């Protein structure tokens, strides 16, 4: 509780209630978005802010989806097609 | 414009025969226009609000939505009141 709030792991949000008071709500920070397995950059269509685990996310309509980006997928497909 | 994705989804669902999804997409398009216009008017960005309201008028003509016209009329009444106050103060 109190040392858990003294640590900076949660966001300190000040909010004014309908009762006229000002309170501090301790809210979670967002989880990191999925990254490409080769470049490490965030994947398009999956970089929305998520604050808890267990939320199903819809991958882009492509082979390998939210695993690799379109650049890596296209280049790998070209290499496999030639090879 | 702003809710063109909603327009495309509406026509795509209607072409595919998904009446339920077409109704949901019509609701989403109305939500897009009305929410964005109302936020603009509350922040007093009247030029952007007027552009959004003109687009909503065109969309309501294109899709036969009465609720869009009703909410646009309410927002235009608010815009008129805001502009009247600005003219009186200035």
């Amino acid at each position: 509780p109190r040392p858990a709030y003294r640590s900076r792991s949660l966001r300190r949000v000040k909010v004014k209630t309908p009762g006229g008071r000002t309170v501090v709500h301790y809210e979670k920070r967002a989880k990191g978005v999925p990254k490409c397995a080769v470049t490490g950059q965030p994947l398009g269509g999956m970089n929305s802010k998520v604050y808890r685990f267990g939320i199903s996310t819809r991958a882009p309509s492509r082979p390998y989806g939210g695993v690799v980006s379109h650049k890596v997928l296209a280049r790998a497909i070209r290499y496999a097609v030639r090879r | 414009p702003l809710c063109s994705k909603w327009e495309s989804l509406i026509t795509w669902a209607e072409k595919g025969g998904n009446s339920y999804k077409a109704l949901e997409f019509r609701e989403k398009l109305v939500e897009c226009i009305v929410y964005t216009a109302t936020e603009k008017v509350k922040k007093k960005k009247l030029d952007e609000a007027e552009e959004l309201l003109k687009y909503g008028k065109e969309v309501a003509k294109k899709f036969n939505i009465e609720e869009l016209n009703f909410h646009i009329a309410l927002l235009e009444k608010e815009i008129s009141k805001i502009r009247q106050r600005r003219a009186q103060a200035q």
Partner: protein, 101 residues
């Protein structure tokens, strides 16, 4: 020219990536029309940017604006029905960031 009518290509981007198709029409320098038949490989007939297709060595003989069953008889003449049904499998572990800079 490589990207020509009767050429077997593989789509690299989009939903149908890795799927084989047959070029049946030419639009301009940027676009050509492909239909590796949707019952056969899964690529519906539509235009495609030439940058989003990778040409193969294989090529078949058909006329411009050829139909889907025309492409089908050409592929069965070449014996390429199973090659058209096969989907290209990338090797993702080989690629490093230098290849996609």
């Amino acid at each position: 020219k490589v990207i020509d009518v009767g050429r077997v290509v593989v789509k690299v981007l989009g939903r149908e990536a890795g799927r084989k198709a047959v070029v049946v029409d030419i639009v301009d320098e940027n676009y050509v029309v492909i239909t590796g038949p949707k019952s056969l490989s899964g690529v519906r007939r539509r235009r495609v940017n030439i940058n989003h297709i990778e040409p193969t060595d294989k090529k078949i003989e058909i006329k411009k604006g050829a139909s889907d069953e025309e492409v089908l008889k050409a592929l069965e003449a070449a014996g390429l029905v199973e090659y058209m049904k096969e989907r290209v499998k990338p090797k993702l572990f080989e690629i490093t960031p230098a290849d996609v800079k």
